[PDB]
CSV table of C-alpha atoms in Angstrom, one decimal:
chain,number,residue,atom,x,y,z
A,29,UNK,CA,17.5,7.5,13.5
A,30,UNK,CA,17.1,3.8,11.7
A,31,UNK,CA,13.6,4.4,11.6
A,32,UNK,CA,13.6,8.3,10.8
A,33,UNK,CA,15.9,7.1,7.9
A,34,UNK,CA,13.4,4.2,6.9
A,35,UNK,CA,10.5,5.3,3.1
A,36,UNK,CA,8.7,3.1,4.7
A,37,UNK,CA,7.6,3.7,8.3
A,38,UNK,CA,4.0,3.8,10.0
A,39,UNK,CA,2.7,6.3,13.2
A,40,UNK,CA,0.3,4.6,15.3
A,41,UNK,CA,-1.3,5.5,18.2
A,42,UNK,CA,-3.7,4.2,21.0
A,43,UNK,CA,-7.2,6.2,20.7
A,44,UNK,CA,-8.0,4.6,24.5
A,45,UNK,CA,-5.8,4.2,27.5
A,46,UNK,CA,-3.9,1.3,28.5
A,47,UNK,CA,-5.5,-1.1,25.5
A,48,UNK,CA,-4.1,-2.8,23.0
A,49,UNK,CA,-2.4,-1.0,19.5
A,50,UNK,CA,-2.1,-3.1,16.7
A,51,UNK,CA,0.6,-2.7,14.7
A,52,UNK,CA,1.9,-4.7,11.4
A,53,UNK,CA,5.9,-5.9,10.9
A,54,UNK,CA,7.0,-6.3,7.7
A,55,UNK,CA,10.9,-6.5,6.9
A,56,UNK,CA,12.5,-3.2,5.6
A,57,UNK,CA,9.7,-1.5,7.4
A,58,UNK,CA,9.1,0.4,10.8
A,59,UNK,CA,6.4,1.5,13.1
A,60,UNK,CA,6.7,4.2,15.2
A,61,UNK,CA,4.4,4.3,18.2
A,62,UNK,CA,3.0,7.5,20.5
A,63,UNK,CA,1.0,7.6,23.5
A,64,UNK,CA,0.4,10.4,25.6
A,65,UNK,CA,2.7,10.6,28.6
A,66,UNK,CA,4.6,7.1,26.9
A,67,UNK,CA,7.6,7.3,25.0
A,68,UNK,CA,7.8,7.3,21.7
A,69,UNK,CA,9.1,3.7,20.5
A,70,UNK,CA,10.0,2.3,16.9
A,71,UNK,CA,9.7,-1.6,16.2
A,72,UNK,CA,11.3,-3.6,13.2
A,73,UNK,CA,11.3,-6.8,12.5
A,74,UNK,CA,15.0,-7.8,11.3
A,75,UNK,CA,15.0,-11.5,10.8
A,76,UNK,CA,12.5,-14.6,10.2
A,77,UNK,CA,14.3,-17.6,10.1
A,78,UNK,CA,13.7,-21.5,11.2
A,79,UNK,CA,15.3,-22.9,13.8
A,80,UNK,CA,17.0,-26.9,12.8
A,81,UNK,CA,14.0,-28.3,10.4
A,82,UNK,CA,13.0,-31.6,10.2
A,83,UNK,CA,15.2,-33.2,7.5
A,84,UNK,CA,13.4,-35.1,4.7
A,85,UNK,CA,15.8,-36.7,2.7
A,86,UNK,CA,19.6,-36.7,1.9
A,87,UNK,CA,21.0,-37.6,-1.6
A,88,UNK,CA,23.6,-38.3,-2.6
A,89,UNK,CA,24.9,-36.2,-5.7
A,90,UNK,CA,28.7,-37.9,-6.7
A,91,UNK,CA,30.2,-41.1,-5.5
A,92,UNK,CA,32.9,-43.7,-5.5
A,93,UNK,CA,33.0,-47.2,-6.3
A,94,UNK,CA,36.0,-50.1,-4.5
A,95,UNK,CA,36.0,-53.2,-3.7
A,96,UNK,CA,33.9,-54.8,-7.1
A,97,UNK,CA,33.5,-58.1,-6.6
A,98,UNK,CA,32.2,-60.6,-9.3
A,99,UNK,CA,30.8,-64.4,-9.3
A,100,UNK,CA,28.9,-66.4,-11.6
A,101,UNK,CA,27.7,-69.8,-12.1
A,102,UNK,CA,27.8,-72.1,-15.5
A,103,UNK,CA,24.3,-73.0,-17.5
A,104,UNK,CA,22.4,-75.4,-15.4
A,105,UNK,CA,23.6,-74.6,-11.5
A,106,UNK,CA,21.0,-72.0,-10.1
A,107,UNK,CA,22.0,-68.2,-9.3
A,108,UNK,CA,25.1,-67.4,-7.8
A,109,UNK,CA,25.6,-65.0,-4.3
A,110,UNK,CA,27.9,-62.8,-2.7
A,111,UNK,CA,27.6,-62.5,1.2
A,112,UNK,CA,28.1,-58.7,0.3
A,113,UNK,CA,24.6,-58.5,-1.8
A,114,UNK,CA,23.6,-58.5,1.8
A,115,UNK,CA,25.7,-55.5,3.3
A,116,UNK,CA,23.8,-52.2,2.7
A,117,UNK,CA,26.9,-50.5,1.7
A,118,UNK,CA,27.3,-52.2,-2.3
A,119,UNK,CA,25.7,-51.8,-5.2
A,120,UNK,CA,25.1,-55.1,-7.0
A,121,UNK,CA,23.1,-56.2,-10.1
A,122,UNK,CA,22.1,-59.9,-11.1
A,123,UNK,CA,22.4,-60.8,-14.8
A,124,UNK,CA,23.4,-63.4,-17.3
A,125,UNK,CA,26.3,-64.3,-19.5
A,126,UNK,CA,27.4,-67.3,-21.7
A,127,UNK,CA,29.4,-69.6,-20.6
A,128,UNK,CA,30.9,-72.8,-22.0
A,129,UNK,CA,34.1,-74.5,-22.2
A,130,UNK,CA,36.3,-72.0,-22.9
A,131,UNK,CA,35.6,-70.0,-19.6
A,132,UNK,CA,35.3,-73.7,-17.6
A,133,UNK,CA,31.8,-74.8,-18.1
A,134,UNK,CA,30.8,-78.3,-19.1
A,135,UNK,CA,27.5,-77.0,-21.0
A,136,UNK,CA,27.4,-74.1,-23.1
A,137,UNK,CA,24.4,-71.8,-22.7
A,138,UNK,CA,23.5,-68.7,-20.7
A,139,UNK,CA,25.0,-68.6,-17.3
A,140,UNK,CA,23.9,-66.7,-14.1
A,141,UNK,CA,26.4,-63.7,-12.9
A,142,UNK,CA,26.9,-61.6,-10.1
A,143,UNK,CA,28.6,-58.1,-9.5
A,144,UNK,CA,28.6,-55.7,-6.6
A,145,UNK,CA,30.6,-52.8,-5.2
A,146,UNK,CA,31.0,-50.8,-2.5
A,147,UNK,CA,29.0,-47.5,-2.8
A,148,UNK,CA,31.2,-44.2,-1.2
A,149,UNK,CA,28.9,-41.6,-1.2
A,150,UNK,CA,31.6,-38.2,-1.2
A,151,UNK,CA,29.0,-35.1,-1.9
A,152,UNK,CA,25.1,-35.0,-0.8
A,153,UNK,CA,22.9,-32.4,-0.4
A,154,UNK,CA,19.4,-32.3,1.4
A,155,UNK,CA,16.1,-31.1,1.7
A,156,UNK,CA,14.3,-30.0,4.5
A,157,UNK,CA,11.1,-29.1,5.7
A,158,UNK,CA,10.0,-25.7,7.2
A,159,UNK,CA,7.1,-25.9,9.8
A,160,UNK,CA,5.1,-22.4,10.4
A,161,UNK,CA,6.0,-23.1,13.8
A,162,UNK,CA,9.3,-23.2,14.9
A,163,UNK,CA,10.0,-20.0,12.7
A,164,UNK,CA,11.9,-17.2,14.5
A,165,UNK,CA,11.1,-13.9,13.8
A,166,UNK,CA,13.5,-11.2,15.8
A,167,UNK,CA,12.3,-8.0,16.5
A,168,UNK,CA,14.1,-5.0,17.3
A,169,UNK,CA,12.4,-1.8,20.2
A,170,UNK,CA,13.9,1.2,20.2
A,171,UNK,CA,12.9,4.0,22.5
A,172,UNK,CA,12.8,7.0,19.8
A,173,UNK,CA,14.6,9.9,22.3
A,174,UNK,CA,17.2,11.1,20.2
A,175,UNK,CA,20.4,10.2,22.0
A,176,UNK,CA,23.7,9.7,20.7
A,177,UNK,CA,26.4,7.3,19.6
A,178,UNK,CA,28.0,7.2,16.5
A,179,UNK,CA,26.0,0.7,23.8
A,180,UNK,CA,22.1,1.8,23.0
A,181,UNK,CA,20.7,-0.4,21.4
A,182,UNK,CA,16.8,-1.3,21.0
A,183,UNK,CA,15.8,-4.0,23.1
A,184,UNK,CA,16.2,-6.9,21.3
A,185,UNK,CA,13.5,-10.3,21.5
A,186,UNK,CA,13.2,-13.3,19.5
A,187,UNK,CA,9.7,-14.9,19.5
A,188,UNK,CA,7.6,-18.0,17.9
A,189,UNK,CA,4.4,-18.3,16.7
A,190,UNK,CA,4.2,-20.8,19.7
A,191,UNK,CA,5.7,-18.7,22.3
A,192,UNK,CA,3.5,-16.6,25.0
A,193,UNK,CA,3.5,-13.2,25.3
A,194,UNK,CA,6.3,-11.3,25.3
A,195,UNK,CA,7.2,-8.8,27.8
A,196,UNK,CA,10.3,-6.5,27.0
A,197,UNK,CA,12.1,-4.5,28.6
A,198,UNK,CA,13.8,-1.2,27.8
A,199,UNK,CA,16.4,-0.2,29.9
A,200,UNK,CA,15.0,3.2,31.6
A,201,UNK,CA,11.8,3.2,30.9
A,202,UNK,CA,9.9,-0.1,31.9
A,203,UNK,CA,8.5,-2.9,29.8
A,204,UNK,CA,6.3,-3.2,26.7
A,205,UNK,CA,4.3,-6.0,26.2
A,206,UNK,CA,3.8,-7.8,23.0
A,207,UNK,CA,1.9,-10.0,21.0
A,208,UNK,CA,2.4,-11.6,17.3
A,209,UNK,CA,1.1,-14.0,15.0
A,210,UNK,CA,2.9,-15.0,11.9
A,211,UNK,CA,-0.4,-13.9,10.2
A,212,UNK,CA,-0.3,-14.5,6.1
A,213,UNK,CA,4.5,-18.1,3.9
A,214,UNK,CA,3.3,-22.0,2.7
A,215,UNK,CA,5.5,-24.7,4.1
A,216,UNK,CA,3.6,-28.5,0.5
A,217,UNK,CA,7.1,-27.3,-0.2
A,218,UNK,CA,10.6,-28.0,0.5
A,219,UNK,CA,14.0,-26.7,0.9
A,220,UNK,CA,16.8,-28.1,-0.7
A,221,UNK,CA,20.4,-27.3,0.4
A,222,UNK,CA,23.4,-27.9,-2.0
A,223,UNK,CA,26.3,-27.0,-0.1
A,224,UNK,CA,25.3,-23.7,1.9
A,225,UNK,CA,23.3,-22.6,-0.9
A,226,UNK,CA,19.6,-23.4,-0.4
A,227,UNK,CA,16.3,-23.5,-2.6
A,228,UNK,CA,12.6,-23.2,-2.4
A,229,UNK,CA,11.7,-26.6,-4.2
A,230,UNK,CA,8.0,-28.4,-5.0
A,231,UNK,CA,7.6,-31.7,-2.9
A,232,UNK,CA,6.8,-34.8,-5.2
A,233,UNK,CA,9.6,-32.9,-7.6
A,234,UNK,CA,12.5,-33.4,-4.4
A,235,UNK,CA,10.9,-36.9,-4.0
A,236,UNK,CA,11.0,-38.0,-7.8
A,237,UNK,CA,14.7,-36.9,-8.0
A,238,UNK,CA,16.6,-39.9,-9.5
A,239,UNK,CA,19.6,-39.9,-7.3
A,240,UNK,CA,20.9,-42.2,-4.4
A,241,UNK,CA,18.8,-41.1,-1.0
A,242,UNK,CA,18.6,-42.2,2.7
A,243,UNK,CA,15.4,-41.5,5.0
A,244,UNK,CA,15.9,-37.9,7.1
A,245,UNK,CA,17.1,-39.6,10.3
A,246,UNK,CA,20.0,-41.3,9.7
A,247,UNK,CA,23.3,-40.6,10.5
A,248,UNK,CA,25.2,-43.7,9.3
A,249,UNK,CA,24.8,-42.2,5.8
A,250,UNK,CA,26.1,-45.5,4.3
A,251,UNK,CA,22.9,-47.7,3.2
A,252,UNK,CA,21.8,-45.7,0.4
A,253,UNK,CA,18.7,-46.2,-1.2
A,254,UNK,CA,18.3,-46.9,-5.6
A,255,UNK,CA,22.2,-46.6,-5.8
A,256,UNK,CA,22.0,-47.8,-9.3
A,257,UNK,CA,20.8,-44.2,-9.8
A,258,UNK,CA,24.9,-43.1,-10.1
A,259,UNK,CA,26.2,-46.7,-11.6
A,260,UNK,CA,26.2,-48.5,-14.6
A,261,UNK,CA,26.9,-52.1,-15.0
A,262,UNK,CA,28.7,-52.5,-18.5
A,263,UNK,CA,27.6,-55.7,-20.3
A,264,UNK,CA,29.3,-58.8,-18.6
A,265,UNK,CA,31.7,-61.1,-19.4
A,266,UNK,CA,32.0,-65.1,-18.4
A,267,UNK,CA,33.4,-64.1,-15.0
A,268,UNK,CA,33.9,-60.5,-14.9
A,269,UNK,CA,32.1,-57.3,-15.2
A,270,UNK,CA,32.8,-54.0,-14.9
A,271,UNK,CA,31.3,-51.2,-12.8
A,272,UNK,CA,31.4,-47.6,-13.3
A,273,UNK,CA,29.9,-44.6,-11.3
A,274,UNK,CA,28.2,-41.2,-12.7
A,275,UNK,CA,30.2,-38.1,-12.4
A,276,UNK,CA,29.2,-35.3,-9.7
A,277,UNK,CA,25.8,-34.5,-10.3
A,278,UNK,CA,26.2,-30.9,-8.7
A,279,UNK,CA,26.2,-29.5,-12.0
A,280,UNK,CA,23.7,-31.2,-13.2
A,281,UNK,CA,21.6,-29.9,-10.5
A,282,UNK,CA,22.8,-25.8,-9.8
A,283,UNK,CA,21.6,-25.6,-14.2
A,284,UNK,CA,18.4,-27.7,-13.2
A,285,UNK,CA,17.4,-25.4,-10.1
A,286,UNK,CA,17.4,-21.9,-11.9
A,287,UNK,CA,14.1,-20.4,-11.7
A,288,UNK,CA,13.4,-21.5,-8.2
A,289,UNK,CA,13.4,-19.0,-5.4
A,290,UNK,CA,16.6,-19.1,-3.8
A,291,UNK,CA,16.7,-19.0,-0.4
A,292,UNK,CA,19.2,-17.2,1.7
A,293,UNK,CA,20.9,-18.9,5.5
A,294,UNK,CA,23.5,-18.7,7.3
A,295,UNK,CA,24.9,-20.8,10.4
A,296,UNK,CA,22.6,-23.7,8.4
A,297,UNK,CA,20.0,-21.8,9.3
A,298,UNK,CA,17.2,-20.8,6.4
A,299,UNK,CA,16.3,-17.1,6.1
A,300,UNK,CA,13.2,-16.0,5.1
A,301,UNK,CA,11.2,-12.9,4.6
A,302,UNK,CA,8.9,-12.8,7.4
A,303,UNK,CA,5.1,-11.4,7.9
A,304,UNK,CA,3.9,-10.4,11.6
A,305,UNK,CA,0.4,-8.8,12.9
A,306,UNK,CA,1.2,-8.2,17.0
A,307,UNK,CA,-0.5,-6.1,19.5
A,308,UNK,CA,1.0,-4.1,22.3
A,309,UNK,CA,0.5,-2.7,26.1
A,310,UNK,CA,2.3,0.4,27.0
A,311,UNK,CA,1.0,-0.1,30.5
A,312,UNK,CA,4.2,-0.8,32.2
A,313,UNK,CA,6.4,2.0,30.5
A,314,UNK,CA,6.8,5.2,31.5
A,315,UNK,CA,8.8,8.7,30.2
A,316,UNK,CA,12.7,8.0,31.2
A,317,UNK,CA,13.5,11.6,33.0
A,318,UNK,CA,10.7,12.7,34.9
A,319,UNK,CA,11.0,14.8,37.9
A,320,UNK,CA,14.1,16.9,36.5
A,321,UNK,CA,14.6,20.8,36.4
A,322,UNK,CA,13.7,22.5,33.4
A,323,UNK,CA,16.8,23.3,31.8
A,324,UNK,CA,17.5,27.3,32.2
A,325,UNK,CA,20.4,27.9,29.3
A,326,UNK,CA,21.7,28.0,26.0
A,327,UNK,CA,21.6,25.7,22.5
A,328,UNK,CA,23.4,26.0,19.9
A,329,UNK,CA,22.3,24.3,16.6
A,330,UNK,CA,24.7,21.6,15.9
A,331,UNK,CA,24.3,22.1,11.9
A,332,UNK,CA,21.0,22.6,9.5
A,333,UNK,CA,17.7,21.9,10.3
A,334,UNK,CA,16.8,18.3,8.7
A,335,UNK,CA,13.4,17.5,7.0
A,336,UNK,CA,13.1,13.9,7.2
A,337,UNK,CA,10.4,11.6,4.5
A,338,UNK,CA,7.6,12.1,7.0
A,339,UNK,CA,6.2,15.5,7.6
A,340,UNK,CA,8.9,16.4,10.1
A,341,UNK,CA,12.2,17.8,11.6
A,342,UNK,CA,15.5,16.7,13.2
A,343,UNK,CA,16.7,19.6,15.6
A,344,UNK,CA,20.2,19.0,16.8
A,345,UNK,CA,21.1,21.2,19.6
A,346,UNK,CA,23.8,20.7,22.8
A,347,UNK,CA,23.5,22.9,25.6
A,348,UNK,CA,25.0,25.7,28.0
A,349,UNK,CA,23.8,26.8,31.8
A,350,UNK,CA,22.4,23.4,33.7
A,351,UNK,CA,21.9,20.1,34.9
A,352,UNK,CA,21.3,17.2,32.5
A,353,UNK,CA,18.3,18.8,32.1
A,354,UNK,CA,14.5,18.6,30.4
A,355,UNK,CA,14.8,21.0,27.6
A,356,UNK,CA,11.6,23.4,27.0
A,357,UNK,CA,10.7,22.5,23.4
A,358,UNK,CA,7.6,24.3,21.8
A,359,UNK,CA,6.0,25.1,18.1
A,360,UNK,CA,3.7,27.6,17.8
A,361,UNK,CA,2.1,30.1,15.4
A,362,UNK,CA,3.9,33.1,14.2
A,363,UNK,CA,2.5,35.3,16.8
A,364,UNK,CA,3.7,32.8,19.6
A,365,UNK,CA,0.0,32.7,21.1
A,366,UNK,CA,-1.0,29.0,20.6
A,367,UNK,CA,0.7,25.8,21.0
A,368,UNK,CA,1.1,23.6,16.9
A,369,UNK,CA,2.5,20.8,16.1
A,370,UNK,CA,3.9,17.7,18.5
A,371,UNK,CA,6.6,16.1,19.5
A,372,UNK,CA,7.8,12.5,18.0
A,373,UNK,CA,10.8,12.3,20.6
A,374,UNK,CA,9.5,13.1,23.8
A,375,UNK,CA,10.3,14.7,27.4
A,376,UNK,CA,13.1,15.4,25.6
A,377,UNK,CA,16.5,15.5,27.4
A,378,UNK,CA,20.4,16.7,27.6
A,379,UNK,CA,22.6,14.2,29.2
A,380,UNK,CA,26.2,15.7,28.8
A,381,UNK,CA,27.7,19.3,28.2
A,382,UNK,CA,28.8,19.5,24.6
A,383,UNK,CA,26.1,16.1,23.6
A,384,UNK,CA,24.1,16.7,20.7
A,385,UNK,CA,20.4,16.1,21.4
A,386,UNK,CA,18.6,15.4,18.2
A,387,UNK,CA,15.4,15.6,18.5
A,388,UNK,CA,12.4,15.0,15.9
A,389,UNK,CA,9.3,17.1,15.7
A,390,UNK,CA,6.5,17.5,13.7
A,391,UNK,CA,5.5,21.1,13.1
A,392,UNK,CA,2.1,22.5,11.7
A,393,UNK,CA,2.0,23.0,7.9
A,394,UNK,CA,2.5,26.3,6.9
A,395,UNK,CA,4.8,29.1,9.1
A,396,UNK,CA,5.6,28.2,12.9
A,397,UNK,CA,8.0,28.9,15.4
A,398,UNK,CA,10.4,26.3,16.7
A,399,UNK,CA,10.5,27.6,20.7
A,400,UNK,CA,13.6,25.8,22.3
A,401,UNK,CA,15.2,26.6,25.5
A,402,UNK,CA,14.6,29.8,27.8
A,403,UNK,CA,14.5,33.6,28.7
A,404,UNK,CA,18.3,34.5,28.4
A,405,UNK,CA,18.3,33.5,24.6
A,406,UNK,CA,14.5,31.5,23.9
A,407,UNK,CA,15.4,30.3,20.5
A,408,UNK,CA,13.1,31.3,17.8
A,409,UNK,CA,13.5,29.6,14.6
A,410,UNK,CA,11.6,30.5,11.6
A,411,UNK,CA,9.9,27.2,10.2
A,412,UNK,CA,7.7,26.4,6.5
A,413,UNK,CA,5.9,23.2,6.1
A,414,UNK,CA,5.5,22.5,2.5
């Protein structure tokens, strides 16, 4: 019904016999595919996302400052240290101040000073990059026979443009075999995540950002790179100086990123609107309900004929007299002489007493005769194609 439901949904069908049918996936799409003596199947592609992307860089976006420490030397004695301007975790500038003897120099003149402080990164967000490869595009086969629910659902199979071909298979019937290639998506681009929200962003843009950043694999995430990015060193003084951090930059960011696609994700995972050309084999599948008796009773039609968006009918109808039997579907012309029409569900079949069967046909344009069932009461319904 997903796919009978669907504007947009293509018919193909193989013009040779056990070759390939191409077929073309796009999301918010189906394809419906017939062969003769093969049941009818319907394929959608629900998902295209990419599986853990190689990180590019994290930065940082609002941070803390403790521990500022500050030393400095009188006119004449070299450029003081800290044993901290060499732990990766402090920011620390070099500058210099005047000095004399009120702050306990023997010279007055320009003095050298010191300042660091330990850099506490609290809110970061990171871009990624997408490789073609590596995507995962989940696809959805349903066998189109018209049963009912309301514990049937289309087989479901997750490929990569990397993995081999797939072969499915759908419970009753066999396997299909399958084929895809992410054919015609650009990944110099990036994706930038700010807290479970992600974006499409330009490399070279992600790259220039003036924030705090550490290379893609790390996991310390204390030796920040160009911290000075988020502090300020206020003018000093003889022998102190004070040190002050930028507020969250969040902000600053979310009002810089609007006009760039926003990308969905869940589960960390990006989300994406895939493309997918793939080829089938119907080879290995075969009509689920052969070699059953041809059910000799009565239908009754659930409720009104449906027309569907693509030429055709939904006939609901529960038997009656039998087995779970083959039902003895047929459109012809008004005069009941030749056969019209096909069959989109096929070898259709009744599974339960009191089960309605839809079942979706295609009848000729113009008048026809919708045949179902047998000799106690054959039901003839009226049908116009318009």
């Amino acid at each position: 019904m997903r796919c009978i439901g669907m504007s947009n949904r293509d018919f193909v069908e193989g013009v040779s016999g056990g070759s390939w049918v191409d077929i073309v996936l796009e999301h918010g799409s189906c394809v419906t595919t017939m062969a003769k003596n093969k049941p009818t199947l319907d394929f959608e592609l629900i998902k295209t996302e990419a599986k853990q992307p190689a990180t590019l860089r994290k930065y940082c976006i609002e941070a803390k400052l403790t521990n500022t420490t500050t030393e400095s030397r009188c006119p004449t004695q070299g450029e003081p240290s800290l044993n901290e301007e060499q732990d990766k975790r402090f920011v620390c500038k070099h500058s210099m101040v005047d000095r004399g003897w009120g702050n306990g120099c023997g010279l007055f003149g320009k003095g050298g000073i010191v300042t660091c402080a330990m850099f506490r990164c609290k809110k970061n967000m990171e871009g990624k990059v997408v490789q073609p490869e590596n995507l995962e595009y989940t696809i959805v086969i349903t066998p189109h026979s018209g049963e009912e629910h309301a514990g049937k659902h289309g087989k479901e199979i997750k490929i990569t443009p990397q993995s081999s071909i797939t072969e499915a298979e759908l419970t009753g019937y066999g396997t299909v075999t399958m084929e895809c290639s992410p054919r015609t998506l650009d990944f110099e681009m990036v994706l930038l995540q700010m807290e479970n929200k992600a974006w499409l962003v330009h490399r070279q843009w992600f790259l220039d950002l003036p924030l705090p950043w550490l290379p893609g694999a790390d996991t310390q995430g204390s030796n920040w790179i160009q911290k000075e990015t988020l502090v300020t060193f206020k003018n000093p003084h003889a022998k102190k100086q004070d040190v002050v951090v930028l507020g969250s930059q969040e902000g600053a960011m979310h009002t810089a990123l609007t006009g760039a696609t926003e990308i969905q994700m869940s589960s960390g995972n990006l989300l994406f609107t895939g493309h997918l050309k793939c080829r089938l084999r119907m080879d290995k599948l075969q009509l689920k309900g052969m070699s059953y008796s041809m059910c000799t009773g009565k239908f009754k039609v659930v409720k009104e004929i449906a027309e569907t968006q693509h030429g055709t009918i939904v006939i609901r109808v529960q038997y009656g007299d039998g087995s779970p039997c083959k039902i003895p579907f047929e459109i012809m012309d008004l005069e009941k002489r030749h056969v019209l029409g096909r069959l989109i569900t096929v070898n259709p079949i009744v599974t339960e007493k009191d089960s309605p069967v839809n079942i979706e046909a295609e009848p000729p344009f113009g008048d026809s005769y919708i045949i179902i069932g047998v000799e106690p009461g054959q039901l003839k319904l009226n049908w116009f194609k318009k």
